[PDB]
Structures are given as C-alpha cells and as structure tokens.
Design a protein around this ligand. Sequence first.
Ligand SMILES: *[C@@H]1O[C@H](CO)[C@@H](O[C@@H]2O[C@H](CO)[C@@H](O[C@@H]3O[C@H](CO[C@H]4O[C@H](CO)[C@@H](O)[C@H](O)[C@@H]4O)[C@@H](O)[C@H](O[C@H]4O[C@H](CO)[C@@H](O)[C@H](O)[C@@H]4O)[C@@H]3O)[C@H](O)[C@H]2NC(C)=O)[C@H](O)[C@H]1NC(C)=O
Ligand SMILES: *[C@@H]1O[C@H](CO)[C@@H](O)[C@H](O)[C@H]1NC(C)=O
Ligand SMILES: *[C@@H]1O[C@H](CO)[C@@H](O)[C@H](O)[C@H]1NC(C)=O
Ligand SMILES: *[C@@H]1O[C@H](CO)[C@@H](O)[C@H](O)[C@H]1NC(C)=O
Ligand SMILES: *[C@@H]1O[C@H](CO)[C@@H](O)[C@H](O)[C@H]1NC(C)=O
Ligand SMILES: *[C@@H]1O[C@H](CO)[C@@H](O)[C@H](O)[C@H]1NC(C)=O
Lengths: 213, 240, 134, 134
Amino acid sequence: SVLTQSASVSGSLGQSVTISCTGPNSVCCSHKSISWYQWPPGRAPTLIIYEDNERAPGISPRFSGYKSYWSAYLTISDLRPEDETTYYCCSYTHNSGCVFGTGTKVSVLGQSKANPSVTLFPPSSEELQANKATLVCLISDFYPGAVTVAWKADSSPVKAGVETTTPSKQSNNKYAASSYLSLTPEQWKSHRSYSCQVTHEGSTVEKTVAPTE
Amino acid sequence: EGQLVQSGAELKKPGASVKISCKTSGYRFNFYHINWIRQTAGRGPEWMGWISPYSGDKNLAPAFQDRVIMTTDTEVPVTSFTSTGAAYMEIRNLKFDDTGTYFCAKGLLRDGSSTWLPYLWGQGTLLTVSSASTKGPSVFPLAPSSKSTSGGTAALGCLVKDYFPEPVTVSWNSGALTSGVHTFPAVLQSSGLYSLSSVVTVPSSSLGTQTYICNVNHKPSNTKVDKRVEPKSCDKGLEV
Amino acid sequence: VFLGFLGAAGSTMGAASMTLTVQARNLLSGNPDWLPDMTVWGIKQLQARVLAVERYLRDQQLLGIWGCSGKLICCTNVPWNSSWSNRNLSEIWDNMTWLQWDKEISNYTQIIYGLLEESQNQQEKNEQDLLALD
Amino acid sequence: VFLGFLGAAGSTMGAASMTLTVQARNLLSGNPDWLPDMTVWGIKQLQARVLAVERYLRDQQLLGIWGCSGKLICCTNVPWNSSWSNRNLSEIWDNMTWLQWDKEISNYTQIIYGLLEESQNQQEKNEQDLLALD
Ligand SMILES: *[C@@H]1O[C@H](CO)[C@@H](O[C@@H]2O[C@H](CO)[C@@H](O[C@@H]3O[C@H](CO[C@H]4O[C@H](CO)[C@@H](O)[C@H](O)[C@@H]4O)[C@@H](O)[C@H](O[C@H]4O[C@H](CO)[C@@H](O)[C@H](O)[C@@H]4O)[C@@H]3O)[C@H](O)[C@H]2NC(C)=O)[C@H](O)[C@H]1NC(C)=O
Ligand SMILES: *[C@@H]1O[C@H](CO)[C@@H](O)[C@H](O)[C@H]1NC(C)=O
Ligand SMILES: *[C@@H]1O[C@H](CO)[C@@H](O)[C@H](O)[C@H]1NC(C)=O
Ligand SMILES: *[C@@H]1O[C@H](CO)[C@@H](O)[C@H](O)[C@H]1NC(C)=O
Ligand SMILES: *[C@@H]1O[C@H](CO)[C@@H](O)[C@H](O)[C@H]1NC(C)=O
Ligand SMILES: *[C@@H]1O[C@H](CO)[C@@H](O)[C@H](O)[C@H]1NC(C)=O
C-alpha cells in the first residue's frame, strides 16, 4: 500500500483526534475521492465518510473530513470509548476500485481502568483419561492492552508448553485474553502446586492450583 | 433491509480452484453493483472486483484479470421492490498468498460519481490454502470454575482441540442459551493445528433446574459433537 | 434520455425530473372523438373524461393557490422539515424513486399542502400588497 | 380569522380580503361522483356542472385579458375615477361590505371592465413589444 497513514494514534476522553492519509504521485490523493472505514478487527466494519468530507447517513457529526492538495484527513470530535479501534482510508475514482491504506490504530485513554479477572483451570478427569494435562488461565476485563503471563510448576518457571494469546477487545469496551500450559501426566503427578501469574501494569494476579486438590 | 448471505467454509489445495456464492435478499438484485473484496494477512485487504447484474459489466483488478471469474444469475422478484438474486465467484490457481476472509457487498447508488461503492457487506467467508489434510476436532468438557466467590458464578465450557481445516461454530442447548456465552479464538501450533475453547457463566444455584449441553458443528469435516458438562465442580472457590 | 411515457418510473428522482413534459403532455389529451351518436354508452365515457378534467383542474387550483404557478419546476420559501424523511441531499435524488418518495412522505404529506397554501400566499400576497406602495 | 366559507360576507372589505382562498377553493370543486349510470337525470346536473366550469372559464378569461393574471390580489395601472364612489380611503375598507360596494359600483361597473381590457393590454403589450428590443 503506497497510501500511507499515521502509524499509531492515541487520544484522550472527550477530545479531538486526527488521522492522516496520503501516498504516490499517481496516488496524489487529489483529483481522487477519499473514504474512511471504521474497522473492528474480526467484526462488521462501517463506512463513515464517503467520496469527500460528506459523511454516511446515521453518522454522528462528531466525525469530519478534509482534503488538501496532497493528502486527506480525518477529524474526530468528542472521543468515546467505543471509538477505540483501527480505521482505514481508501482512495478511488468513479470507475476504479478501492485502494486501502496502511492503517491507524486508535486508543482513547482517560477512561476508568478495569481490574482484571484471571481464572485458573486444571485438566478434568476425561483429560486424565487422555493422558494429557492442560492448565487454562483466562483473562478478562482489563483496560490496558498489555499482559505478561508466567507459568510456574511448584513455583519454578516453565518454558515448554507455554502458550499465550493476544489481547482481544471485549464487546463491553474491555479486553480479554487467555494462556494455556501443556504438561504430561508424569509432570502433572510430580509437582505440588501450579501457578499462573499475570503481571498487570499496576498489579499482578496469581492463581495457584494443585493436582492433589 | 437487504440481508445478504454468502457461502460456507471450504478447504482446498494450492493450484486448485474454489467457488464462493453470494445469495441476496430484501432488495433489488439488479439495481446495484456487486463488489468482491478479500482480506489476507499477507498484503492486507485488496479490492478484487465489481460486477453489474443489470448491464452485465464487470471490472476486476489487473492482478485478478486471469484467475477470478464472477458470474451472476437473474433476479427472482418476490415483491414489486424485493428480489432474490445470486452472485458466484470462482478463483483458480490457488497460492499461499490467497488465504483469508473474502467478502461480497452491495453497490452504493444507482447513479452519480460513487455508484458501486460497497455499502451492505456480507458476513464473510474464510478460505485457507493448504496442502494438509482435513482432520476432525477433539471435543472435551471443562470443569466448572468460580468467578466470584461472594457472587456465586460458575464458568463451564467445552474444548475443541487439534483441527486443521476451517474453524467451528458451537451452540448451547441447541441454541437455547445465549447469555454468558463467550467464545475464544483458535490457536496456531507448530504443526499447523488450530484449537479453541468456549465457556458460559452459569448461576451456582442452576444445577438441578437446568441442563447445559454444548453442540460443536465442524462443517468442512462434516462432524458434530454434543457434550454434556458435568455439574460436579472441582474448584475450591465454586463448591460454596 | 426520453424512454417515452413513464419511462423513468423506476429510475432516480433526478433522472425522472428530466421527463416532466413527457408525463405532462399525455395525461390531458387522450382525446376520443365521439361524433357517432350512441345513446347510453356515451354518458359513461363522457363522465370519465369530464371527471378527468375536473381532477386536472383540482390539481391546477392547488398549483395556483401556491406561490408556484408555472406548470414546470418551481421553488418555494417554505423550509424543509427534518422530521420529514431524515435524509441528506444526493441520498434522495440518486437512490430513490418518486413512488417510494411519496410513500415515505404520505405519513406527513397532508400538512405540507397546508404549509404551502397558508404559510405562503396568505402572507406572501399580504406582504406584496404592503411593500408595493413605495 | 377564518370563520369558514363566506364567513366575512357582512364584515369589512379589508377583513374580507383576508379570506380570498377560502371563497376561491370551494366554488370550483363541489365534485359529485356520477359513477351510477342513470338515464335522464344525469344530463341536468351534468349541464349544471358544465355551465359552472364555463362561467369559471369566462371569469378566468376576463382575469387573463387584463394585466392581472395571478389568481390572487393584484394591482393595475388604470387610475381610480373620482366619479366612481366619491369616497376616501379607510372609509371603504373599514365601513363597507363587498355587497354594498358592488351595488354602488353597479351603476359604473360596466365601463371599468372596458378600461381594464383596452386601456391596459391593448397598449401595455404594445409598449412591451416596442420597449423589449434594446
Ligand atoms: C435500471 O437500473 C440499473 C441498475 O440500477 C441502472 O444501471 C446503472 O446505470 C447507471 C447510469 O444510469 C450506472 O452508473 C454509471 O456507470 C458508468 C460505468 O462506466 C463506464 O465504463 C465502462 C467500462 O468499464 C463502460 O462499459 C460503461 O459503458 C461506462 O462507459 C459510469 O460511466 C457512469 O458515470 C457517469 O456519471 C458521472 C456522475 O458523476 C459522470 O461524472 C461520468 O462522467 C459519467 O457521465 C455512472 O456512474 C450504473 O453503473 C448502472 N449499474 C448499477 C447501478 O448497478 C440503469 O441505468 C437503470 N435504467 C433505467 C432506464 O432507469
Ligand atoms: C440508497 O443508498 C443509501 C446508501 O447505500 C441508503 O442509505 C439509502 O437508504 C438507499 N435508498 C433507499 C430508498 O433505500
Ligand atoms: C416540523 O414538524 C414538527 C411537527 O410536525 C413541528 O413541531 C416543527 O416545528 C416543524 N419544524 C419545522 C422547521 O418546520
Ligand atoms: C444530514 O443527515 C444527518 C444524519 O442523518 C442529520 O443529522 C442532518 O440533520 C442531515 N442534514 C440535512 C440538511 O438533511
Ligand atoms: C371619469 O369618468 C367620466 C365619465 O365616465 C369621464 O368624463 C372622466 O374623464 C373620467 N375621469 C377619469 C380620471 O377617469
Ligand atoms: C361608514 O361610516 C362613515 C362615517 O361614519 C360614513 O361616512 C359612511 O357612509 C359609512 N359607510 C356606509 C356604507 O354607510
């Protein structure tokens, strides 16, 4: 994509924010029409701005657009928690197709932070019949998009079988993730307690189970 | 009120071909262009091409001029303002770069400078170009877990593990349970395996009045697994 | 493009506005020649083409009592109300037919005639009389 | 104030001028629907509502041949004659009805139509033709 936008953009609560969109000499972002797309990753996107500063029907007037002689601009007044997602710009003509840009992640801060919900699960009896063992560490309802998970067998670090997901946005404007630990029945029987530690940026939630209990 | 539906998930090999449908409803099929745009993680989204069911005029990207063929049927008018058409798309010469979610959408306006612009999008259709084999999943139950000891909330679910082809949808009690249903994304193993889980937050008092059965429906493998989660807990924070 | 009588019934309102004279010229003169003198069958079609001109003259009276009077396109001074079809420009004239338009307006269409007959000439004429003496 | 159809028949001419559309809209469309086909009784009422539109079109021809043409209030260029109703302003519009007005004018009303049809468009049009070339 020669259509270059802003790298990564943050913002504050109830303020404005600006996203850029420009590119190549052929793609001079001038005699061409510009549109903007709100793209929730993995869900239904939305057209908000089409062909110029004119916005789509139903869009609140908090959004606005501008077109200079070499680039296009997106302005957002009164930032809301549901606006915390990635946007994209497209340049096109009446006959040519769409040309997406590089992308611009948006993070609106100044909101009420969320204390996380971390839950630990052992393998059940049916998995003990399967001769495997999987610790399940589920994370939800935390505001900043950064978590670090550590697995400790008898309070001793584990490196093999450690898998941790990526932060995923909860539909309630929070975040969610998970992490698993695969172990063998020999390593399941030869330990006392298992620990999943999730180090938050302002706290740390640790959950401890045991095969004997 | 146009409620469009695309095709189902399918698995193919590189160098082969696959055909994706795009069934429409609730609007005049011949009044709007039909766009087709993909989303691949290797090059981001790329506009593939649009077509006109009325005038029979298509327009592809020069990169898709040889391998993409888009066809449309004639609309089936239901009322004076509603028709049920169909738009198919066949793609050949499958490579590793053509793996992702594909979309078809309705044109914007019937006249003006932006007529074909995609407004109403379909739900999408994920394709994975792989030489591997279709392997069914392994579905396990999950032991209930305490979520709030003072509140009394349990968390029970099902575990879909080790399936190579397209992902799987899961219902609860034949779709009779939607409150608390929270589904986790899949994994990527070193061998190329995908595996996820699902869970629901149930009342701790709901152990002798309701029954919770998860229903896994793997369509590319054409399998179904109906599991019953045992109400006997094992978390020390949940027995109370 | 012409496409003859009613050719733009399913086209946009903007494209349909290009053929006003076409729909106007074929509604008033569907002239049947009734030179043969046949008793009971003439009164029915005569009543028909008399009620036709009665309806035509009702429409002409409605188009005369307003500030508009030319049997053409015309602008007024009554503002459009946002409650009536909450839509922007180019959304109406480029993705809508006159049929669906009148259908959506039919809920609020009855008061627009009153706003055009009273809020205009019942005050525009009076302002014309009290501003033409200087 | 409206007071409906003919409500200001005994009010002043100024107050009666506030209800011109009211008296205008109810004279042309007293529409009877003659869908039933009844022999000798339809011709009488049909002749009635045809002579109605004939009289209406006679009035419209009289209001078109004059410089006035809008079916509303209108001003001319024919001066009022002091011989016709030797009265001042506000004496007419605030203590007189249109009935008594037409009664007093009926003695001199017949020449006013001629002064409006000949002293105006038989010369105003000709002046318009000989003053529109520059
Ligand atoms: C019945 O309903 C159908 C479907 O709604 C209508 O079909 C649409 O018709 C409109 C125009 O009436 C189409 O809009 C136009 O698309 C043209 C495509 O362009 C060119 O290039 C290709 C090659 O790729 C040629 O094959 C083709 O013939 C064209 O030459 C555009 O060129 C048009 O643009 C015009 O308007 C803009 C206004 O901004 C000007 O700037 C341009 O210079 C140009 O004049 C226009 O965008 C639309 O694509 C059709 N299909 C749809 C909507 O799906 C029928 O018209 C309609 N018929 C009736 C009688 O109502
Ligand atoms: C025409 O298209 C626009 C945008 O696609 C849509 O908002 C509008 O409702 C459409 N018109 C009708 C009559 O549906
Ligand atoms: C629009 O209509 C509503 C109700 O019919 C009325 O209350 C309002 O004043 C109107 N506004 C305008 C600008 O005409
Ligand atoms: C345009 O549309 C927006 C959103 O639908 C609406 O708020 C605004 O009042 C509209 N403006 C006009 C002039 O119709
Ligand atoms: C008024 O009328 C009389 C007779 O009808 C005529 O002699 C006289 O010239 C007229 N005056 C004006 C100003 O019209
Ligand atoms: C109205 O009153 C004035 C003065 O009282 C009088 O001169 C005039 O004749 C009256 N109008 C009529 C029609 O009698």
